[PDB]
Subunit: 99 residues, 5 copies
C-alpha cells in the first residue's frame, strides 16, 4: 500500500490517491490530438503521464515514464497521486512498490 | 487486445489499427538510403518507428523505441496505430500490453 | 556491509552512514511542495535523492536514480551516506551491493 | 535469420551481411587511438559500433549500442551489415533477433 | 579472460590490464572530495570510472557506467585497462564478458 509519506504528500493536494494499481498497457502516441504518454490499469482506468521540458521536472517526469514501464513489464503495483476530475486524469506523483 | 482508449484514438486518424503483434526483430540502420529504426513481426511485416528532434515528440518517439525493444526482448505483444502512406508503414502510436 | 572505501568516505563528512537498507518503494513527485525523487525502506524510513543540473553532478545524481530503482526492482540492498539536516534526509552517496 | 527486409537493405549497400552472430564481449575505450565502442563475437571477430554527434544518426547509433549490450547480456543473436575487409569492421546496421 | 584486441589496446598505454574481476558494489558519490562513480570488487579493490563532458568521450563513459552496473547486477566479469597513477585507479577501458 501507499507509504505514509506518499499518502501525506497527496492529501495536501487537491488530487486523489489511488493505491495498489496494476498497470497493463503503456502507450506512446504522437497523433496531434492525443500527443502524449498514457497508462491503463487492469480496471480500465486511463492516466496521462505529466510532461516537462525544463529542469527540474524534466527529471521527475522522465522517471515517471521509467516507473510506469517497469510496472507494466514486471507486474509490480503502483500508487498514484492524480487529478480527480478529468478523462484521462493526469499523474502528479507515482510510487513504485516492491511490497 | 487494444484498450478502448487506444482504439478510439487511432480511429480518429487516417491510420489503421494493428492488434496483437508479436515483434521478433529490432533494427537500427544508418545507411542514408534506408536510415531508420524498424521492427519486424513474427509474420514478417515491417514498420518504421517515428522520429522527431523537437520537444515534445522527441520524448514520445524515444518511448516508442523503448517499447519496441522491450517487446522484442520479452515476447510481450503490442497494438499499433500505423499509417499506410509509406513503405514500410510508420508507427504513430503504440501500446505495450502485459494484459 | 558497506565497503571500507564507502565507510571511510562517509565518515569524513557531516552526514551519517546507513547500511544494508532494503528499498521497497521508489517515488517521483512533481507536486509543488513535494517536488523530487524519494525512496522508502522496508522499515518505512524515507530519503530524498539529491539532484543536480550541471555537469558533473548531473551524471552522479542520474546514477543515484538508476541505483535506487535497481534496488527496488531486484531486492538488492544499498548502503547510504545521508545528511539528516533535511526532512526527509538527503542521499549524498549511495552504494549498490550484490554478491 | 536476417529478416528479408534487412537482407534487402544490406544487399543494396557495399557492406557484408553477417548472420546469426553471438556477441560475447562489449568494450568501451577512451584511450587516444583505440577510443570507441566494440563488440566481439564468440569466434573472435571484432566490430566497431558507429558513432555520431548529429541528429538523426545520434539516435540510431545510441540504439545500436543498446542492441549490442542487450545481445551480450541475454545471449540473443544479431544480424549485421558491416564492412568486410578491415579489422575492426564497422557496423552500419544491426538487427536484434528474438526469432 | 580479455580478448586479444582489448589486451593489445591496453598494452599500448601506461595503464595496466586487470582481468576476470567480479564487481560487487556500484557507488555514486557527490561529496566534495569523493565526487564520482566507483566500483568495488569481491576482492575489495576499488576503481574510479572515467568521466567526460564532451563528445565523443561522454558516449564511451556513459557506456562504462552501464557496463559496470550490469556487471554488479548480473555477476558477469569484466576486464579493465586501469591507470595506477591516481588513487583509486582510474578505468580507461572496460570489457564486459558473457561466455
Amino acid at each position: 500500500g501507499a507509504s505514509q509519506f506518499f499518502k501525506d504528500n497527496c492529501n495536501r493536494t487537491t488530487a486523489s490517491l489511488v493505491e495498489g494499481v496494476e498497470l497493463t498497457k503503456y502507450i506512446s502516441d504522437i497523433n496531434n490530438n492525443t500527443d502524449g504518454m498514457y497508462v491503463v490499469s487492469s480496471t480500465g482506468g486511463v492516466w496521462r503521464i505529466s510532461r516537462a521540458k525544463d529542469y527540474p521536472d524534466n527529471v521527475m517526469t522522465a522517471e515517471m515514464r521509467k516507473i510506469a514501464m517497469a510496472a507494466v513489464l514486471s507486474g509490480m503495483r503502483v500508487n498514484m497521486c492524480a487529478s480527480p476530475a478529468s478523462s484521462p486524469n493526469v499523474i502528479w506523483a507515482i510510487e513504485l512498490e516492491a511490497e
